[PDB]
Ligand binder design. Structure first.
Ligand SMILES: [Mg+2]
Ligand SMILES: [Zn+2]
Ligand SMILES: [Zn+2]
Ligand SMILES: [Zn+2]
Lengths: 131, 130, 435, 188, 131, 58, 143, 205, 49, 462, 112
């Protein structure tokens, strides 16, 4: 995996090499062992972990429709910013698109995680994140 | 990495750059190897100036450039075909042969192109009191 | 765990100028340090006579004690910039393997295993972070040092030693005399000066000669004491305008007079010599004349023959070697040496002094640039690991750039002052100093 | 400012090792000396303060030392700061001396940047052109009709000649008197 | 006449807000910056990057960054007024979600938004107060 | 969006981490080839549109 | 790498940090195999290594090798370089493309298009295939 | 307090110049009161050449250091006095040196009287015994004859020596003027002693 | 934790004769200021060293 | 006649006017036809009078081959004047100091005498001047505006009326200035503003633009040819008057010519395939840092370094093949003949041998293999023999961060044909900070007597 | 009559440096070291070796087969026919003040 996008810009040499750290998010996805001075690159290149894979585009429309039909999801028109702030509603996003609101974020996230585990309503390769 | 691929040795003669007159770069081009400015710094620190002459003038680009003492501008001198001419002074020309490098000649020609006149003040002649 | 239990009950009260989190981190870092006793088991499981690894480490051939303690008996706490593993993964988390706001030491980079025992996944990950940090710092320091080296070389290269052994650029003087002694860096040896630390009574006992009643030896002892006083004054003053410079009796000199005297004595067949007033007086006179003519090393031998005036700065340059010759060729120290042996000793001293001078076409500027640039990489690594200091941002090339770029006071960081108390009587009380 | 010396963020107490000559003339290294280490530099304020001895104020700031004390104090401070930066495995003192002397030869502390080079060697057009900004330096030299003597390393190098240092510093001339008495002409 | 491999390239996530302290800038009024590379549908459709800058002058500006409107630091309330918003109270509500609430966050945000409203952009000044 | 940015100004939330892989993606050869094809095919569609447009007028 | 958790891989490279196809006849499975070798073909040999000081010829990361180990074919193979794109020179055996199996020395011209392609590499080479395919435009192509 | 140190050390500076006071010394409280009421304090001294040197100590806040007109009037009236002036020393607060108008007044007065030396200095120069500071090497002024002999021996021109500003605190205390040579006895670690000679150049401001 | 032989703990060479001790990085090591090679260079020249 | 040995003691930089170009140039470009047949077209931009790039045709001016001719400048007579790209700023300053109707300055020259000479003009220009009235003439100085679109166009704004200051008007304005004004403003007599407008430009010597192809596509030659063509398009002796209107096509052509000159000199230079003369100098790849400081050299080898416990600290092991490649030049004399005869007889068949013999009477280098039987080694000839054990060689490792990075080692030739590495004692590595982990090193054997002496006596690793 | 200015060529305003006079300091007034520096000894040996390569006539009685050895032994035996000129000053009046040193009467440094 190459990060040459940064290399194109006139980024500081010290800053660029600074990016070659091992980050706390790498484990399980990017090999943490060093390049072993392979010589193909100074080290800007990184290798995927043994079990790491890359997900392909899912069916966002089906999940969006399912969420809209879900009783917990409230459409943006129905909710009011004052209602969101006061009643403690939770914003719901799909691919960064704010589709609606929810009363309890944790319950919705857990329910859709269960649906994913069943593997019928939700595809296994869909990320569900609760902040 | 194999030693046979990494090694390289070159003799006096080989391809030369058209512009600077220096050896072509690298082994792929069958040219010479580079003595960067760090090597020049080290050689200067050791005081090795005859080595610097041998490497950067004889082995690298090296040329006798003729400069008119009267005006300090490059002149025309050819011994085989008799030519002793200065465009500026005409008569009163006093040609002197300085040792230089084709790279420096190209550098001075580039500077002159930009309408920057370069006058070289040749070292004065010195005579015994006699 | 005791520190953590204190944290849960809120007992930790940080001192002035430190937050609770910073004090807790410092306490945890201090608590997790390995003791020296960790080396007891290691030395109990190895036979020094027949252990290759230990023999390599101890003899200095390769390795170090920390390497042995990491290979066997545990790596211990991992430190980056003198700090534990910061929670980068998430708010209050260091890795996916530990809970938010974890309290155990293992969650912040404490390795209880050794390389031989084997490292678990989090321990391996933390070690990987530390090693990659070392590599990245090394690369950054190399790049910065190369940049500063190019700039310094082009800023200093014009300085060349001339026929007066001065340093000048296009005849404009940079130094009146190269190095302030006019010597080559490769022609110096460290020699100890005996009279620096001696007391007045000790100096008199060890150096005053009483065999002959002539006032010449009184003059010699007076010269010794005067030179000692000059050295003491100059170097105390030197230590008074530096943060931590300390007076030292060892100095780098071009000639080791003591070694020459010892070698001549060793090859001397006469061994112990009888008493001869004429020989003693002649030796003293020869030593005095040699000391007087010493500055003529820089000037010709012709001028020495003509006894022309000597510039002041050349006398100052020769002062240190004059002092060393006085100390090491004193009458008490040269009693079993004949006049011929003394003449040979003086000739050898002069020859070595002339051979130790700097040449007349040296590009001293490039030498200085290279010498000052080389240690900068290691300085960058050490300064990066110097972040422990609080309130001063000396990390990186910040301070070398401040020095070389002549940044104004406003742009300076990590500025400091050392202030001494008004009188030498109240400076030994800590409460007054704190007040 | 309610109290204290402006510019001094913090002030801690430190222990100092200092040599001193006692009544007997012996040089003893006193270890129980207490001094104050500050987090900011203000030499003038420290001088004004009565509790602090004003003749032994040490500051790590080269600019403040140059302002308050002078060029020689600035040179000594440059030496000390470079030595501190060097570390344990520092170079010989003469290289630090060279740095400080070059940086302070004009009566003011000049940097090693291109500005310092311009301040120290304004007429060396070729050297400054070699370091950086060839076009701007060339334009300025042409406008000002600068005359550059050929000295140092960069100037002869850019002109194709070899520097006159090292083995070429001193001229060699033939001994006519010796040869005319010892050697014979090829024709003769 | 050769073998070539198009290596996987790492890029920034899309439809997500990236907030960067632009301290690297030299003598720049901007103190923080917010990038939002918006993209509809799949990964092959056109994407537009909106940059939200907060300056030392106190003005929040938005740059569409498309060929059109490129390098234009449009004040945010201008954008709000164009699309239908009429009152400044509603405009501030869209950001704070509540004007009645007295939480310190709300008050500080309202103060910043006032300072951004009143400050006069060198460009768009004539239009600034236009109803 | 503005609200979030303001929260960072107040120091309530820290600035986004660039190195973190939560906000990163790994695009294969498809995306790069698609971009190159976009540029080249746009050029090759501009080239005939002017040529055809000029020809029809004539 | 086996027992990677028992080594600190960065410090291994800390000294080494910063700074045409070979076909090897013989390869063997490592005596201490890892999972990674269930998915890649091992390339190397189980060499008998002695950890000792023998004459100081293996210092500073140097290694002393057995001449017989080299002769027996250990780490021996074929390096392939393709002149697919294509003074005093031989020209005698060029015959257009030279016959296969002919030693090519420095200076001799590999192909003759006077137009010819000289051999610059100092190491001698042997012609493997002189087959000439057809270029993209049907022009004569040399492989 | 700067005023206390200035009062203590200005007379030490006068003594270090081998000068003799022409008026009796006043007490510190009166000195402060004069500085406040009049805005300046005047000290007159006589050199060995019988030239008169006047030192003006200006308060931090005052009409002279704020409006150029009063400073111009004061300087013009002072210089017109029948006393044979060798130098005028004006001690001001540091930011006063950064005010253009005052500096233009000083430059104009210098131009109007080429034969008089007019210098304006900060407080910090005279708030301590400069020569006694440990960090400052020992400076001395060498006569033109010794400098000429040294240059002739060394085959040097005055422009080839290292330059030292005429307003360097040690040089200010010494009293050297531009075109003079100062010998400095440096303490060095490579060699215990060292001697250098520096050429005095124009004073900043 | 170790037993040291009384002869090894100190290195003493007198007039080129190794009276006592062991040679290691301190004496013969590279970069060792004051080592035997430094003294050999000082007394007899770098080539002899 | 002979040219005596000489050295350069100083270099003087100055602004080159059109007079300098006319005097120095050896020809005038008149046609845009690049080539006539194989030989360069006479009167074009590749005229042989300006130098030779190819071996077949020699320099007409000095009768030298591609080597030994430095390039010989040419001229191009511009039908309309063009401003100097490198001094545009200077021109602006002058326009802000001197009256546009007469030559007298509008500023007081005595307010800047105290300032040091270089800064006088800059300070004077910095002063506001719009609306100031000239003392000698009633004309009031207008504002001078620099066009933002380009780096050379100037406008004059007088009471709200804007006009374009064409190069001819600027030249006429500057020609009215007096040398006294130039001197009083800190500039020298050679920096008179009048020469800031060029009627004839210098076509650079062929040597600096050897991209001519006998008869990519991006070169300075293309720019020069385009400039010549567009200049030919301009009407000859075009006269431009203050306030006069110009045909739009003529104005466009003049702007094109000025922009072509500006791009030829200062394109893509701090204020991709854009050739410019002044972009050659800067950067690590530029002329100064890549060609002048540092160089490529012949007679040099590079190889991997390994260890050898049987080599002294001042010896280096050299492969036999490299010894046969690199050579040492020995001048045959009455004392070398006996020692050099075995080298000559061995030739290229045995070791030690030789490669070439430079015969002085013929002044020619002959390869030993092709040497005739009658050929003999004679006094004055130079024999290039192989490197033998005992020779001295410079050994270097990069980066060269210390003065010991380059050392001189005695050559020990390893006659084993299977060894191809530079073998050194391990204890020597401390000089170069090297390890036998794949580190490579350069090695070159001096061949001249002076260099060999210097290497043996001064640069020895001892 | 207003006068226009045409800039003359730079060459016209250029005046070549006037010839200098060699001022040899008297033997007794020399102040430069009487011991050859390593640079000076190396330069002397190199120049003598090159001139030996040009012309083989040598004063040394012993016979050597290399110019370098002949030059080295000439320097050591004090038979080298070259002189060392040390340029001290170049005065503006047009004088080159130099010191002439005889290698045969000078001290020789450690070249090996
Ligand atoms: Mg290595
Ligand atoms: Zn001429
Ligand atoms: Zn020619
Ligand atoms: Zn007018």
């Amino acid at each position: 995996v190459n990060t040459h996008n940064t290399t194109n810009a006139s980024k500081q040499t010290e800053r660029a090499d600074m990016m070659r750290r091992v980050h706390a998010s790498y484990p399980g996805y990017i090999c943490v062992a060093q390049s072993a001075d392979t010589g193909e690159k100074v080290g800007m290149s990184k290798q995927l972990a043994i079990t790491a894979n890359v997900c392909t585009a899912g069916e966002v429309l089906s999940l969006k429709q399912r969420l809209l039909s879900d009783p917990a999801i409230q459409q943006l028109a129905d909710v009011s910013n004052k209602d969101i702030v006061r009643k403690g509603l939770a914003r719901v996003f799909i691919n960064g698109e704010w589709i609606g609101c929810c009363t309890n974020a944790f319950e919705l996230a857990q329910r859709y995680r269960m649906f994913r585990r069943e593997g019928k309503i939700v595809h296994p390769h869909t990320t569900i994140y609760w902040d | 990495k194999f030693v046979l691929d990494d090694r390289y040795a070159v003799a006096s003669y080989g391809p030369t750059d058209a512009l600077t007159g220096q050896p072509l770069d690298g082994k792929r081009s069958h040219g010479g190897l580079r003595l960067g400015e760090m090597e020049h710094w080290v050689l200067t620190a050791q005081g090795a100036m005859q080595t610097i002459i041998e490497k950067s003038h004889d082995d690298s680009d090296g040329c006798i450039s003729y400069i008119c003492r009267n005006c300090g501008e490059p002149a025309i001198y050819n011994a085989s075909h008799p030519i002793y001419k200065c465009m500026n002074c005409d008569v009163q020309a006093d040609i002197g042969m300085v040792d230089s490098r084709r790279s420096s000649i190209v550098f001075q020609h580039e500077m002159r192109a930009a309408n920057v006149n370069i006058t070289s003040v040749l070292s004065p002649r010195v005579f015994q009191p006699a | 765990e005791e520190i953590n239990n204190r944290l849960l009950h809120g007992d930790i009260m940080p001192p002035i100028g430190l937050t609770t989190h910073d004090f807790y981190e410092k306490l945890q870092l201090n608590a997790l340090k390995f003791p020296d006793r960790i080396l007891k088991p290691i030395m109990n499981s190895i036979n020094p006579e027949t252990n290759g690894l230990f023999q390599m480490v101890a003899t200095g051939a390769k390795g170090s004690n920390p390497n042995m303690i990491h290979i066997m008996a545990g790596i211990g706490q991992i430190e980056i910039n003198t700090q534990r593993i910061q929670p980068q993964f998430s708010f209050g988390r260091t890795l996916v393997y530990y809970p938010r706001f974890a309290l155990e030491a293992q969650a912040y980079g404490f390795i209880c295993n050794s390389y031989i025992a084997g490292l678990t996944s989090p321990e391996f990950i933390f070690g990987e972070m530390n090693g990659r940090f070392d590599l990245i710092n090394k690369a950054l320091s190399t790049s910065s040092t190369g940049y500063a080296n190019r700039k310094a070389i082009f800023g200093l290269q014009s300085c060349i030693v001339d026929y007066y052994r001065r340093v000048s650029i296009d005849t404009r003087l940079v130094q009146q005399l190269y190095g302030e002694d006019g010597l080559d860096a490769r022609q110096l040896e460290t020699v100890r000066f005996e009279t620096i630390m001696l007391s007045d009574q000790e100096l008199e006992d060890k150096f005053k000669y009483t065999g002959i009643q002539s006032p010449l030896f009184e003059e010699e002892f007076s010269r010794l004491k005067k030179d000692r006083d000059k050295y003491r004054q100059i170097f105390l003053n030197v230590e008074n305008f530096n943060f931590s410079q300390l007076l030292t009796d060892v100095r780098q000199v071009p000639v080791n007079v003591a070694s020459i005297v010892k070698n001549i004595l060793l090859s001397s067949t006469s061994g112990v010599l009888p008493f001869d007033e004429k020989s003693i007086l002649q030796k003293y006179a020869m030593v005095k004349t040699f000391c007087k003519n010493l500055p003529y090393v820089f000037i010709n031998n012709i001028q020495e023959r003509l006894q022309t005036p000597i510039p002041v700065y050349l006398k100052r340059a020769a002062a240190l070697m004059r002092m060393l010759i006085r100390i090491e060729l004193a009458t008490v120290k040269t009693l079993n040496i004949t006049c011929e042996q003394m003449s040979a000793i003086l000739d050898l001293i002069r020859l070595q002094y002339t051979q130790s001078l700097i040449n007349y076409g040296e590009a001293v500027g490039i030498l200085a640039a290279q010498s000052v640039s080389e240690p900068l990489t290691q300085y960058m690594l050490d300064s990066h690991h110097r972040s422990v200091a609080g309130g001063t941002n000396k990390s990186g090339i910040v301070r070398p750039q401040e020095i070389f770029s002549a940044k104004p006071v406003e742009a300076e960081q990590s500025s400091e002052m050392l202030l001494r108390l008004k009188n030498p009587e109240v400076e030994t009380n800590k409460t007054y100093a704190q007040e | 400012t309610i109290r204290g010396i402006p510019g001094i963020k913090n002030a801690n107490v430190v222990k100092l090792m200092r040599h001193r000559v006692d009544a007997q003339g012996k040089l003893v290294r006193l270890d129980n000396i207490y001094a104050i280490k500050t987090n900011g530099t203000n030499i003038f304020g420290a001088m004004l303060d009565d509790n602090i001895d004003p003749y032994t104020i040490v500051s790590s700031s080269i600019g403040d030392t140059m302002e308050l004390y002078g060029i020689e104090a600035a040179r000594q401070k440059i030496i000390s700061e470079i030595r501190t930066v060097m570390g344990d495995k520092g170079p010989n003192h003469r290289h630090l001396l060279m740095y400080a002397d070059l940086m302070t030869r004009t009566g003011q502390v000049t940097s090693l940047e291109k500005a310092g080079l311009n301040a120290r060697e304004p007429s060396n057009v070729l050297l400054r052109m070699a370091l950086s900004s060839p076009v701007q330096v060339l334009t300025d030299a042409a406008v000002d009709s600068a005359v550059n003597p050929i000295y140092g390393i960069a100037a002869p190098t850019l002109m194709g000649s070899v520097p006159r240092i090292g083995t070429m510093y001193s001229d060699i001339i033939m001994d006519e008197k010796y040869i005319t008495e010892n050697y014979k002409s090829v024709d003769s | 006449g050769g073998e070539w491999v198009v290596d996987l390239l790492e890029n920034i996530r899309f439809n997500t807000l990236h907030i960067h302290y632009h301290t690297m800038q030299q003598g720049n009024n901007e103190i923080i910056r917010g990038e939002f590379i918006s993209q509809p549908g799949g990964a092959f459709e056109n994407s537009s990057q909106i940059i939200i800058r907060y300056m030392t002058t106190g003005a929040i500006t938005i740059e569409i960054n498309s060929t059109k409107f490129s390098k234009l630091r449009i004040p945010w309330y201008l954008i709000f007024r164009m699309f239908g918003m009429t009152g400044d109270d509603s405009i501030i509500e869209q950001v704070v979600f509540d004007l009645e609430s007295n939480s310190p966050v709300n008050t500080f945000m309202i103060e910043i938004l006032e300072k951004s409203i009143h400050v006069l952009d060198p460009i768009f000044q004539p239009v600034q107060h236009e109803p | 969006l503005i609200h979030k940015i303001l929260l960072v100004i107040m120091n309530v939330f820290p600035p986004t981490d660039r190195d973190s892989y939560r906000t990163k993606r790994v695009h294969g050869s498809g995306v790069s080839l698609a971009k190159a094809f976009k540029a080249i095919f746009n050029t090759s569609v501009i080239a005939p549109i002017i040529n055809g447009f000029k020809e029809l007028l004539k | 790498s086996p027992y990677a958790n028992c080594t600190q891989p960065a410090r291994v490279t800390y000294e080494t940090n910063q700074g045409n196809r070979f076909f090897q006849f013989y390869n063997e499975m490592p005596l201490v195999k890892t999972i990674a070798h269930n998915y890649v073909i091992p390339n190397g040999l189980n060499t008998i290594v002695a950890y000792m000081i023998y004459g100081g010829y293996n210092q500073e990361d140097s290694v002393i090798v057995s001449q017989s180990f080299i002769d027996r074919g250990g780490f021996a193979g074929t390096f392939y370089r393709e002149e697919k794109v294509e003074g005093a020179n031989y020209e005698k055996l060029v015959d257009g493309f030279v016959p296969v199996g002919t030693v090519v020395k420095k200076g001799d011209i590999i192909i003759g298009k006077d137009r010819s392609v000289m051999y610059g590499f100092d190491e001698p080479a042997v012609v493997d295939a002189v087959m000439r395919p057809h270029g993209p435009n049907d022009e004569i192509f040399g492989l | 307090m700067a005023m206390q140190k200035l009062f203590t050390y200005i007379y030490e500076f006068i003594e270090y110049r081998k000068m003799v006071l022409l008026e009796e010394k006043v007490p510190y409280d009166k000195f402060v009161q004069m500085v406040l009421n009049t805005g300046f304090f005047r000290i007159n001294a006589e050199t060995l050449n019988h030239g008169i040197v006047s030192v003006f100590i200006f308060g931090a806040n005052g009409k002279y250091v704020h409006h150029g007109g009063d400073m111009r009037t004061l300087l013009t009236n002072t210089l017109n006095e029948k006393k044979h002036y060798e130098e005028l020393i004006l001690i001001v607060d540091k930011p006063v040196l950064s005010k253009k108008n005052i500096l233009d007044i000083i430059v104009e007065q210098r131009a109007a009287n080429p034969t008089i030396v007019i210098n304006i200095y900060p407080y910090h120069l005279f708030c301590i015994n400069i020569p006694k500071v440990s960090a400052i090497p020992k400076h001395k002024l060498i006569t033109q004859e010794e400098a000429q002999e040294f240059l002739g021996r060394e085959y040097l021109q005055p422009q080839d020596l290292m330059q030292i500003s005429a307003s360097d605190p040690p040089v200010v205390w010494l009293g050297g003027r531009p075109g003079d040579f100062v010998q400095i006895e440096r303490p060095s670690e490579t060699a215990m002693h060292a001697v250098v000679i520096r050429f005095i150049t124009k004073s900043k401001i | 934790y170790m037993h040291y032989n009384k002869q090894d703990i100190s290195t003493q060479i007198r007039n080129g004769e190794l009276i006592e001790g062991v040679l290691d990085k301190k004496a013969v090591g590279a970069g060792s200021s004051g080592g035997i090679y430094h003294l050999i260079s000082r007394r007899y020249g770098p080539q002899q060293a | 006649m002979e040219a005596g040995y000489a050295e350069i003691a100083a270099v003087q930089f100055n602004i080159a006017g059109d007079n300098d170009h006319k005097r120095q140039g050896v020809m005038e470009v008149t046609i845009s036809n690049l080539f006539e047949g194989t030989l360069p077209a006479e009167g074009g931009i590749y005229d042989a009078r300006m130098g030779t790039t190819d071996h077949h045709y020699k320099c007409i001016t000095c009768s030298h081959q591609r080597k030994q001719c430095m390039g010989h400048p040419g001229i191009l007579q511009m039908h309309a004047p063009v401003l100097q790209p490198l001094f545009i700023a200077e021109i602006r300053r002058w326009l802000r100091v001197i009256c546009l109707n007469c030559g007298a300055p509008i500023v007081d020259l005595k307010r800047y005498e105290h300032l040091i000479r270089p800064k006088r003009l800059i300070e004077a220009a910095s002063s506001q001047t719009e609306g100031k009235q000239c003392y000698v003439c009633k004309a009031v100085h207008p504002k001078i505006v620099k066009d933002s679109e380009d780096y050379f166009t100037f406008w004059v704004d007088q009471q709200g009326k804007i006009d374009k200051l064409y190069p001819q008007i600027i030249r006429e304005i500057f020609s009215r200035v007096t040398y006294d004004t130039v001197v009083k403003l800190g500039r020298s007599k050679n920096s008179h503003p009048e020469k800031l407008v060029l009627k004839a430009i210098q076509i650079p010597p062929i040597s600096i633009r050897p991209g001519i192809r006998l008869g990519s596509f991006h070169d300075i030659n293309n720019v020069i040819q385009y400039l010549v063509r567009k200049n030919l398009l301009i009407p000859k002796d075009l006269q431009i008057v203050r306030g006069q209107k110009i045909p739009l096509n003529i104005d466009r052509n003049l702007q094109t010519i000025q922009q072509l000159y500006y791009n030829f000199l200062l394109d893509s230079v701090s204020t991709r395939p854009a050739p410019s003369i002044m972009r050659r100098l800067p950067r690590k790849e530029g002329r100064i840092r890549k060609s002048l400081l540092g160089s490529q050299v012949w007679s040099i080898s590079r190889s991997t370094i390994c260890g050898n416990s049987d080599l002294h600290l001042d010896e280096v092991g050299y492969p036999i093949s490299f010894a046969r490649t690199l050579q040492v030049a020995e001048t045959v004399q009455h004392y070398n003949i006996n020692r050099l005869m075995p080298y000559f007889l061995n030739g290229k068949r045995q070791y030690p041998g030789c490669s070439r013999v430079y015969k002085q009477i013929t002044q020619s280098v002959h390869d030993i293999e092709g040497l005739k039987q009658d050929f003999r080694l004679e006094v004055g000839d130079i024999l290039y023999r192989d490197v033998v054990t005992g020779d001295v060689a410079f050994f270097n490792r990069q980066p060269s961060l210390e003065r010991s990075s380059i050392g001189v080692h005695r050559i020990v030739v390893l006659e084993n044909p299977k060894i191809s590495t530079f073998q050194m004692n391990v204890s020597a590595c401390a000089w170069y900070n090297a390890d036998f982990d794949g580190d490579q090193m350069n090695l070159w054997v001096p061949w001249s007597v002076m260099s060999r002496v210097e290497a043996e006596l001064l640069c020895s690793v001892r | 009559k207003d006068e226009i200015v045409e800039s003359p060529s730079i060459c016209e305003g250029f005046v070549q440096a006037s010839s200098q006079t060699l001022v040899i300091i008297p033997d007794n007034e020399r102040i430069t070291s009487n011991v050859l520096t390593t640079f000076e000894a190396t330069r002397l040996v190199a120049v003598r070796a090159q001139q030996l390569a040009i012309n083989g006539s040598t004063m040394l009685k012993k016979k050597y087969s290399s110019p370098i050895d002949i030059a080295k032994q000439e320097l050591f035996n004090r038979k080298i026919p070259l002189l060392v000129m040390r340029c001290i000053k170049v005065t503006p009046e047009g004088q080159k003040i130099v010191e002439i040193w005889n290698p045969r009467e000078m001290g020789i440094p450690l070249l090996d």
